Amino acid sequence: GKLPPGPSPLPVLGNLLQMDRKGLLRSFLRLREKYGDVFTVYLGSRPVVVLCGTDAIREALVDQAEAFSGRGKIAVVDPIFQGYGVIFANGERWRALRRFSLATMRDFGMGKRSVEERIQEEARCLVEELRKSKGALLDNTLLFHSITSNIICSIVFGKRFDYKDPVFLRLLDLFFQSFSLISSFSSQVFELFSGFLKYFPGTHRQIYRNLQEINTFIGQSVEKHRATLDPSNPRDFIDVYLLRMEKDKSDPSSEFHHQNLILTVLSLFFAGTETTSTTLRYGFLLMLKYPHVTERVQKEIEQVIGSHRPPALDDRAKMPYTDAVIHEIQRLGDLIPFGVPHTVTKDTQFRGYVIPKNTEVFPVLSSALHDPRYFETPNTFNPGHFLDANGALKRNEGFMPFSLGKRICLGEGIARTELFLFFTTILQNFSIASPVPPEDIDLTPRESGVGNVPPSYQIRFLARH
């Protein structure tokens, strides 16, 4: 039957000649226009099936969600992970690392209460930290990273850190830079010709280091727990893991090594801290660019929540507009443009084509968030996309920033919450302004790649009365 259509690949370099010089994302979209919604591009000696548009990403990830449930390697970070840990695990190892990781969070707040009170509590510390700066010029990057990070730490590490704790900031600064580098041009280059470049110095190297430092700290805490582990009273993801580890003294085919702990924690620590926050950050840029939206987002925080209490979770259900503004931020944000590398397990008959077992599939999520089919004016910040004539939230098929299928984000729950509770609580005690006029605001991503890092802007949170 053969693979989907796609430019013929030269030996070794593959389609290095049909790519675009702007990046993997821009390259895929250009290939889409000539070869369709489902095409095969060769990233080196690698045949990968690209999926563009809402319908093409669902017909695979949702309706044949079993064949497309495989995970692929990422050039730069594969060295660290090597198929280990919950994010890059595959097969039985994955199923059980998800089964665990997922149900571990549930034991510590993923049931959305003891976590809500944690997020709420964190916002309280944010509001106090910001109010203390008297609303001067600050880069909200390292501070937003903190609030979202402490939420996964409240679960995976038990403790939380201080916004000024030295060891804590170093951890966060690493996650910030490690994400930029991974999303940089060279990382996308390294994706194609890793087999050659991996012998020379470059960014892919400073990535290995950066993460190995967070690994050093991870193990350093894993031991700090080990020596104080009380079985009758597990404290966090670690303890429970060390326990599921103790209940398997003999089985050498348990998928719970020291490896999977050091690497699963890394995944949750990273993922949890990182994307939830850059989304909060990208968000507040829009909130400066389209201020009339900010005012209306506040008029709702007022009409529904008031000024006395904090924003609680159930409040989101009674704030249609604000739920849409968050949704749109998340849509035009698009922190993970082409998703995380998928692969097919079985030989998959799909749209007339046959995709070989273990062939990689790239779900172009960005192409679904921007599908003209499912969005009027896809190219502009528009809270209306998610509103019916009445003014109540309207589900949109094309809204998948967390992706779809048996491989959907675990942070779906905590993230969407962190977003809302953090977005409102801030806008409830602060109003934002920047020296850069709404007209001169440039949403254009400082770095566009596997991730989509927004520029770093100066902003100030002005107290309210």
Ligand X SMILES: *C(=O)Cc1ccc(C(C)(C)C)cc1
Interacting residues toward ligand HEM by CB under 6 A = 71, 86-87, 98, 152, 267-268, 271-272, 275-276, 279, 335-336, 339-340, 342, 363, 401-403, 407, 409-411, 414-415
DSSP H helical ranges for 157-229: 166-183, 185-197, 203-226
Quick one: which of 42, 270, 386, 420 contacts ligand X (CB under 6 A)? 270
Q: How far is the CB of 311 from ligand HEM (least distance, A)?
A: 18
Check residue 271 for interaction with ligand X (CB under 6 A): yes
**3-class DSSP state for residue 405?**
coil
3-state secondary structure of 411: coil
| Shortest distance, position 437 Cβ to ligand HEM, whole Å | 28
Q: How far is the CB of 81 from ligand X (least distance, A)?
A: 8
Q: Site mask, ligand X, residues 431-460, x = CB under 6 A?
A: --------------------x---------
Residue number, 77 or 368, with CB nearest to ligand X: 77
Q: Cβ neighbours of residue 109 under 8 Å, at least 6 residues apart?
A: 115, 116, 118, 154, 155
Rounded CA-CA distance 336/355 in Å is: 24
- Give how far the C-alpha of residue 377 lies from the chain's centroid of Cα atoms, to the nearest Å: 24
User: Contact between 44 and ligand X (CB under 6 A)?
Assistant: no
Pick 117 or 202: Cβ nearer ligand HEM: 117
255 binds, among ligand X, ligand HEM, none (CB under 5 to 8 A by kind): none
Q: Judged by CB under 6 A, does residue 77 bind ligand X?
A: yes
Residues 179-208 that bind ligand X (CB under 6 A): 179, 182
Residues 6+ away with beta carbon under 8 Å from 402: 408, 409, 411, 412, 415
Residues 6+ apart with CB under 8 A from 134: none
98/198 with CB nearer ligand HEM:
98
Contact between 275 and ligand X by CB under 6 A: the answer reads: yes
DSSP 398-459: T--SS--STT--STHHHHHHHHHHHHHHHHHHEEEE-SS-GGG-----SEESSSEEPPP-EE
Q: Is 87 in the site for ligand X (CB under 6 A)?
A: yes
State the minimum distance, in angstroms, from the CB of residue 145 to ligand HEM: 12
Nearer to ligand X, 267 or 431 (CB): 267
- Give the span between the Cα atoms of 189 and 24, in whole angstroms: 9
Please pick, from the candidates 191, 274, 315, 328, the single residue that binds ligand X as defined by CB under 6 A: 274
CA angle 24, 190, 215 (to 5 degrees): 110
- Alpha carbon separation from 179 to 151, 175, 226, 276 (Å, rounded): 19, 6, 30, 13
- Consult the annotation and say whether 125 binds a ligand: no
Q: Could you tell me which residues are annotated as the binding site for heme?
A: 409
Which residues are at the interface with ligand X (CB under 6 A)?
A: 74, 77, 87, 179, 182, 267, 270-271, 274-275, 335, 340, 451
